């Protein structure tokens, strides 16, 4: 389900998988923190 | 009449002057009489496969012929025995040699040939026509099992001209003289059977009677019918030993055949040290489990052929015990190791590989082996009935389940009990991931529930949907917190947590929670569903659920503590107490609404 | 005591020895005799080249009146006219005596310490029969490696088989030397011995091994079987059999708690692929022979304690993943046969951490039977889990530091971040000659744990926290 | 090759041979030796194809005794657009660098669709230089190669992240890559340019960048030329 480079390119794709996982987790946690700080801004601006 | 060696190559040997030998006979090659089996025959020369190490052999050594394929001896004395993959007694071998090794080129009878057994005549007399598989006498083997029956091996008929009367005999005293065209037929207290041929049977039946293990979650949500297959993943941190021990001690079967099909060795030492200490208490503390079990041990050092024939040997023994009218329960250890041994043998033979390097036999071999299981009526006159229920244990390559072995096993078997390590640290000691494990025998088991416990199916379903709803709810709870959730959702969540921590979790060592019978679990899920539905109904008409929880904290604690209730007290007085508790909860809720 | 009767019966009986001159063809590292009489699979032979030089070999196959010898030291210079082939009449055997300790043996077992002959106390077949499983028991007590990162977190119970994976350009050999130098029991020795067989090593490494074991006194507790890289491969495959056999003899006929090391198995795999190419067995997965499982099992599974004898045994095979992938067949099979593994990270080595061990992938399945009371202190199993969890937390905390600054991190995160660096720089970092007892390592681990507030160490039991957290 | 050798080494006149489609030659060579049962090589080809192709190629170069020259420009055809195939692999092992052709450029309608990133000519450093050519020839090429690689990698990374994570370097590199691909490489079938005109175009392209990020170029040439 992609352009198919078949020339012993396994290591490259595994590296891509690891990078994707790392970025996914990091961005997940960043979004968590930003939303947490967004809630308090909402409350305080309202008040 | 013998055979002289003509060539040798590692594990390959070529004989000579071999005329009149089948394609799978056994041969006692070598002066020390190493065991082997013919593979290819080309005129006079015939290829032979060896099991032990062939170092030191010399051309011209005589070669013998056994006269049968790979076979196993059956008869009284199997219990309390520990065998190798090829029906070899280890205790007797060690005692005889006094060493700590298996000295190559050693042959001892599979069954002890000295212990005298007390035989009692059956129900036939001289001159009576007989047929294969007909019981003609019993033997007292143990206080646990005392009706070890004696059969007439299949493929044998005629009329009996002399039967030994009662007395005490050994395994080498002809106790019957069947007369046919040739009156040469004699019979002793035992006989043999080729391993690779399934035992004949009158007719297979449909397994419907549930197999209860004593655990709560197992029989509550993922039952196994007594006579079917099953599979459980093999992992290190999962701790499957609990499942095997509980199955051995508390299940309703009558004979267990554990099979070690290639382990690290130290694990075999652990299990062998442990089993003789497990105790069962029915009609008194009948001390051992070994009196109800035969174990096949195969450490990695064992010869490849022996390491491969282990499951065949075990299943053949199980079928034999099934045909006596008893109920059996086979338990493999690591089918992955068996597949590894099969692939190694194929590679050594130098054959074409297949998917992922494995041979092409795997699918058919596994299919036939599993089909050998089931429930049937034995072949004979008394018309007894038995059952067999294999319990496989698949271990992956490195965790991934893309290997052909796992795919084929899952495609064949019907019940999967997924085990998760993550629960181990959290100590859900029955570590069953309820979102993955599944069963497929419900459609049949309902025909038993209705006869006994009509409400069981709807209750088990209801908790299935309850758990699914709770786990889905938590997902959005994390997103928006419990604040934006109605009281019904919080009710679902907290009842789900209560169920998780009471109904599922099980210490397994407490005197009360060690072994939960059926009716007790019936009462438990009835009570839990009643509590939840009654509380939600009360909230439905309008009431702050926080106040309801404050009022009924005692009721919640009571339903939780009901699990601590000690069974084995009245087994119906327990039902009376459960009814009292249910009525108390009902009236407490009714008053609370007011 | 009647062993003397058997010794004399087969002892004082001399037999003649044939001598052939019928070399009738050759094919690379093989040799083909023609008119042998009653040959014997897996014999030992002594060739005699026309120049007077002498070599050895070992038959592989036998047709009707034919043998196929393969020569250890190559085949150059032989001839089909003057070479004479002398048979032996019995398979390879090793001279075994209690007094191996101290001496150094070559690949084939000929002493190379400029010392006298072995003066064998007996002879044995190199590859003995397998242990009877019914006569085997579980590990029980612990072995003191002396390495902080191993003993504290990956203790080795006697009777275990824990390999040590490592990459190509890593100081695994130095770690093995340190382990062999610092090994010993624990006293909460007259019973300890070591067998250190090395196969396929450079000359510099061999010289370093010899010189270090000489001047550090450890020599008289060991018996090395060196085998350089340029020596015949068949001798390479032979060497581990010799080492295991002698260790087994010592353990199970003198009741000595012994420890064996191999220092390599990849080169063993190469030597093994070489064989079966002399034969015409087609290559298997990745070119390796398919049946390596059986022989590797034979190598490894001669270990563990035994029922009757008081002796014991332990193995620490050392692998070398080709391209740092666990998917390779050798590490896969080794993990399948053995219990747990010990890793060696490249990055830590780059940062100058010695021993460059990473603990996240490490594991020892028999720990639970190793630690305890009497056998060791009571707080080992809890500190192990606590430190593992906190290291795991610290890694990801360091990861998030770069993306979300430092202030947004919880107090837990900052404490874990500091603890990670302190742990790496002090606990694991151990001098090449720094020997530590288990008690000292436990004390240092307690010191590191003292970073956190007493309450927060959730995974540790309250009893231990109360007992030891003081001071 | 025999005719070329005769003409070049026995008539004293420069030659330039152009033999096409070595792939068909290799296929025919495989067909033979397959009628036989020789130990097949990688992917079924004969083991001695390396020696065969070495025999074919080596007939080239110059000799002091004569003053004629012979130059080879063989044409290849990778089966599945992969350079790891045995034929191109051995050809690269033997010859001195190769000129690559890419599918992507042709898809984008660029002629001649030459991909410089995997191409090289080992003898370039010896041939170019002052006197022979302009002094900047030996370093402008390296600078352009570096910038092309930077632009390619920046575009590849941006394809998944986007502009937001781009510094000034990435923004400059993307546009430079666009201009280079669409102006320098592209040229008409009958259009030709001397070395000096191409150099001037290269300097025009490079002048986009500030004077300080052209680190790979020597200060003297940079000062002399980038000024105007």
Swiss-Prot record, chain A:
Function recorded in the entry: Subunit of the V1 complex of vacuolar(H+)-ATPase (V-ATPase), a multisubunit enzyme composed of a peripheral complex (V1) that hydrolyzes ATP and a membrane integral complex (V0) that translocates protons. V-ATPase is responsible for acidifying and maintaining the pH of intracellular compartments.
Superkingdom, taxonomy of origin: Eukaryota
Subunit structure: V-ATPase is a heteromultimeric enzyme composed of a peripheral catalytic V1 complex (components A to H) attached to an integral membrane V0 proton pore complex (components: a, c, c', c'', d, e, f and VOA1). Interacts with RAV1 and RAV2 components of the RAVE complex, which are essential for the stability and assembly of V-ATPase.
Other comment: Present with 8500 molecules/cell in log phase SD medium.
Transmembrane segments: none
Family named by the database record: Belongs to the V-ATPase D subunit family.
Protein's name in the database: V-type proton ATPase subunit D
Compartmental location: Vacuole membrane
Name of the gene this protein is made from: VMA8
From Swiss-Prot, chain D:
Coarse class of the protein's main subcellular location: membrane
Record has Transport as a keyword: yes
Subcellular location: Vacuole membrane
Positions that bind ATP: 122
GO MF annotation list: ATP binding; proton-transporting ATPase activity, rotational mechanism
Keywords on record: ATP-binding, Hydrogen ion transport, Ion transport, Isopeptide bond, Membrane, Nucleotide-binding, Phosphoprotein, Transport, Ubl conjugation, Vacuole
Keyword Ribosomal protein: no
GO biological process: ATP metabolic process; endosomal lumen acidification; Golgi lumen acidification; intracellular calcium ion homeostasis; pexophagy; proteasome storage granule assembly; proton transmembrane transport; transmembrane transport
Assembly behavior: V-ATPase is a heteromultimeric enzyme composed of a peripheral catalytic V1 complex (components A to H) attached to an integral membrane V0 proton pore complex (components: a, c, c', c'', d, e, f and VOA1). Interacts with RAV1 and RAV2 components of the RAVE complex, which are essential for the stability and assembly of V-ATPase.
Function: Non-catalytic subunit of the V1 complex of vacuolar(H+)-ATPase (V-ATPase), a multisubunit enzyme composed of a peripheral complex (V1) that hydrolyzes ATP and a membrane integral complex (V0) that translocates protons. V-ATPase is responsible for acidifying and maintaining the pH of intracellular compartments.
The protein's name in its UniProt record: V-type proton ATPase subunit B
Taxon lineage: Eukaryota, Fungi, Dikarya, Ascomycota, Saccharomycotina
């Amino acid at each position: 389900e992609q352009v198919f480079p078949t020339r012993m390119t396994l290591g490259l794709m595994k590296t891509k998988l690891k990078g994707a996982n790392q970025g996914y987790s990091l961005l997940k946690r960043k979004s968590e923190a930003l939303t947490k700080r967004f809630r308090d801004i909402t409350k305080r601006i309202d008040d | 009449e013998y055979g002289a060696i003509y060539s040798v190559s590692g594990p390959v040997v070529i004989a000579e002057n071999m005329i009149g030998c089948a394609m799978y006979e056994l041969v006692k090659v070598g002066h020390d009489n190493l065991v082997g089996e013919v593979i290819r025959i080309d005129g006079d020369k015939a290829t032979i496969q060896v099991y032990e190490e062939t170092a030191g052999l010399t051309v011209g050594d005589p070669v013998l012929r056994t006269g049968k394929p790979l076979s196993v001896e059956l008869g009284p004395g199997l219990m309390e025995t520990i065998y190798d993959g090829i029906q070899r007694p280890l205790k007797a071998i060690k005692e005889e040699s006094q060493s700590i090794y298996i000295p190559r080129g050693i042959d001892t009878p599979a069954l002890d040939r000295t212990i005298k057994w007390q035989f009692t005549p059956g129900k036939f007399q001289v001159g009576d026509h007989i047929s294969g598989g007909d019981i003609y006498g019993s033997v007292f083997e143990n206080s646990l099992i005392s009706s070890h029956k004696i059969l007439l091996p299949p493929r044998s008929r005629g009329t009996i001209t002399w039967i030994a009367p009662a007395g005490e005999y050994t395994l080498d005293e002809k106790i019957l003289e069947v007369e046919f065209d040739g009156k040469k037929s004699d019979f002793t207290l035992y006989h043999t059977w080729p391993v690779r041929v399934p035992r004949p049977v009158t007719e297979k039946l449909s397994a419907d009677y549930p197999l209860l293990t004593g655990q709560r979650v197992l029989d509550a949500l993922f039952p196994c019918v007594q006579g079917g297959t099953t599979c459980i993943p093999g992992a290190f941190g999962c701790g499957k030993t609990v499942i095997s021990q509980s199955l051995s001690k508390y299940s309703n079967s009558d004979a267990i055949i554990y099979v070690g099909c290639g382990e690290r060795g130290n694990e075999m030492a652990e299990v062998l040290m442990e089993f003789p200490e497990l105790y069962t208490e029915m009609s008194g503390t009948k001390e051992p489990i070994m009196k109800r079990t035969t174990l096949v041990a195969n450490t990695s050092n064992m010869p490849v052929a022996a390491r491969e024939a282990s499951i065949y040997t075990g299943i053949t023994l199980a079928e034999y015990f099934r045909d006596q009218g008893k109920n059996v329960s086979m338990i493999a250890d690591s089918s992955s190791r068996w597949a590894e041994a099969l692939r190694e043998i194929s590679g050594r033979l130098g054959e074409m590989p297949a998917d992922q390097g494995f041979p092409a036999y795997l699918g058919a071999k596994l299919a036939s082996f599993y089909e050998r299981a089931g429930k049937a009526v034995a072949l004979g006159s008394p018309d007894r009935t038995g059952s067999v229920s294999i319990v496989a244990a698949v271990s992956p390559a490195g965790g991934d389940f893309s290997d052909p072995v796992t795919t084929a096993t899952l495609g064949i078997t019907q019940v999967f009990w997924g085990l998760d390590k993550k629960l181990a640290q959290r100590k859900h000691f029955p570590s069953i991931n309820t979102s993955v494990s599944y069963s497929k025998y419900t459609n049949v088991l309902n025909k038993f529930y209705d006869s006994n416990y009509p409400e069981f199916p709807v209750l088990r379903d209801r908790m299935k949907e309850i758990l699914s709803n709770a786990e889905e709810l938590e997902q959005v709870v994390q997103l928006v917190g419990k604040s934006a959730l109605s009281d019904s959702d919080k009710i679902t969540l907290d009842v789900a947590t209560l169920i998780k921590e009471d109904f599922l979790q099980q210490n397994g060592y407490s005197t009360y929670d060690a072994f939960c019978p059926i009716w007790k679990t019936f009462d438990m899920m009835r009570a839990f569903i009643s509590y939840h539905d009654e509380a939600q109904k009360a909230v439905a008409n309008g009431a702050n659920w926080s106040k309801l929880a404050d009022s009924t904290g005692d009721v919640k604690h009571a339903v939780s503590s009901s699990k601590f209730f000690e069974p084995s007290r009245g087994e119906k007085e327990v039902h009376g107490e459960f009814e009292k508790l249910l009525s108390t909860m009902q009236e407490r809720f009714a008053e609370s609404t007011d | 005591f009647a062993i003397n009767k058997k010794a004399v019966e087969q002892g004082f009986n001399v037999k003649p020895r044939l001598n052939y001159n019928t070399v009738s063809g050759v094919n690379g590292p093989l040799v083909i005799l023609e008119k042998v009489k009653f040959p014997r699979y897996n014999e030992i032979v002594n060739l005699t080249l026309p120049d007077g030089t002498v070599r050895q070999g070992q038959v592989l196959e036998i047709r009707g009146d034919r043998a196929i010898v393969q020569v250890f030291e190559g085949t150059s210079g032989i001839d089909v006219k003057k070479t004479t082939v002398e048979f032996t009449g019995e398979s390879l055997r090793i001279p075994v005596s209690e007094d191996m300790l101290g001496r150094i043996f070559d690949g084939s077992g000929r002493p190379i310490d400029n010392g006298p002959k072995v003066f064998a106390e007996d002879y044995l077949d190199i590859n003995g029969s397998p242990i009877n499983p019914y006569a085997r028991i579980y590990p029980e007590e612990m072995i003191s490696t002396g390495v902080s990162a191993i003993d504290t977190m990956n203790s080795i119970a006697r009777g275990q088989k824990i390999p040590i994976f490592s990459a190509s350009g890593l100081p695994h050999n130095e770690i093995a030397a340190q382990i062999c130098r610092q090994a010993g029991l624990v006293r909460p020795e007259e019973n300890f011995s070591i067998v250190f067989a090395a196969m396929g090593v450079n000359l510099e490494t061999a010289r370093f091994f010899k010189q270090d074991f000489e001047e550090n006194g450890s020599l008289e507790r060991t018996s090395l079987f060196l085998n350089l890289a340029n020596d015949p491969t068949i001798e390479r495959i032979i060497t581990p059999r010799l080492a295991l056999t002698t260790a087994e003899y010592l353990a199970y006929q003198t009741e000595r708690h012994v420890l064996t090391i191999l220092t390599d198995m990849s080169s063993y795999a190469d030597a093994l692929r070489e064989v079966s190419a002399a034969r015409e067995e087609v290559p298997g997965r990745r070119g390796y022979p398919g049946y390596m499982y059986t022989d590797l099992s034979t190598i490894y599974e001669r270990a563990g304690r035994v029922e009757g004898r008081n002796g014991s045994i332990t193995q620490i095979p050392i692998l070398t993943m080709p391209n740092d992938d666990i998917t390779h067949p050798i590490p896969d099979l080794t993990g399948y046969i053995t219990e747990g593994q010990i890793f060696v990270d490249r990055q830590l080595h780059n940062k100058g951490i010695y021993p460059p061990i990473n603990v996240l992938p490490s594991l020892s399945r028999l720990m639970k039977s190793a630690i305890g009371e009497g056998m060791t202190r009571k707080d080992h199993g809890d500190v192990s889990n606590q430190l593992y969890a906190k290291y795991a937390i610290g890694k990801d905390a360091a990861a998030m530091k770069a993306v979300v600054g430092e202030e947004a991190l919880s107090i837990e995160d900052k404490l874990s971040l500091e603890f990670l660096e302190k742990f790496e720089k002090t606990f694991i970092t151990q001098g090449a000659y720094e020997d530590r007892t288990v008690f000292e390592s436990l004390d240092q681990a307690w010191s590191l744990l003292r970073i956190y507030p007493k309450e927060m160490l959730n995974r540790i039991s309250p009893k231990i926290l109360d007992e030891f957290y003081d001071r």
